[PDB]
Ligand binder design. Structure first.
Ligand SMILES: Nc1ccc(CNC(=O)NCC(=O)N2CCCN2c2ccccc2Br)cc1
Ligand code: NA
Ligand code: NA
Ligand code: NA
Length: 164
């Protein structure tokens, strides 16, 4: 059915724990598959070793730029960018997993995990899953953020993959 994937996250080389995510392949199969394959690394690239580069408390934690590590890059398993699949799922609260973008039809690999309800993003960012377990780990990441988005420690996805 829907993939179950994980991210193992550290701060300055010290493990924070594991975030487990359900990917809603039943609703957004192309977007879920991109994220799933970027977690396993099976296309030869993906999230392992990349950072949460923008973390804003009471908003979201953003990651996935594994090419430039600064929020300007990333790429999908299909190419540089792929279309917005649909906007069926909404930003209903903390734990929502959604695609970052540079406007319409610019999904690549960057994504974010919400720490509040961000419904003002509905219809603009493609939601494709949610946190199953590890929201406390997401809160630890959040604690190293700032209003500017700059982190006070280097937040790295040390490992990632698929559980089922
Ligand atoms: N393929 C690709 C994808 C993205 C980018 C860089 N674009 C970017 O970060 N846009 C901002 C964004 O997506 N987001 C999601 C949550 C944080 N955020 C936000 C949204 C509304 C208002 C304030 C903020 Br902050 C380059 C290449
Ligand atoms: Na369910
Ligand atoms: Na905000
Ligand atoms: Na269009």
């Amino acid at each position: 059915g829907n993939p179950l994937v994980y991210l193992d996250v550290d701060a300055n080389g010290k493990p924070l724990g594991r975030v487990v995510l359900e990917l809603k392949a039943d609703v957004v199969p192309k977007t879920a598959e991109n994220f799933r394959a970027l977690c396993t690394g099976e296309k030869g690239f993906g999230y392992k070793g990349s950072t949460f580069h923008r973390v804003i408390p009471s908003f979201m934690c953003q990651a996935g730029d594994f090419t430039n590590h600064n929020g300007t890059g990333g790429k999908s398993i299909y190419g540089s960018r792929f279309p917005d699949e649909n906007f069926t799922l909404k930003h209903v609260g903390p734990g929502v997993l959604s695609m970052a973008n540079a406007g319409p039809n610019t999904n690549g690999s960057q994504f974010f995990i919400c720490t509040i309800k961000t419904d003002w993003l509905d219809g603009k960012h493609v939601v494709f899953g949610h946190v199953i377990e590890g929201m406390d780990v997401v809160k630890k990441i959040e604690s190293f953020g700032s209003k500017s988005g700059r982190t006070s420690k280097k937040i790295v996805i040390t490992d990632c993959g698929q559980l089922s």
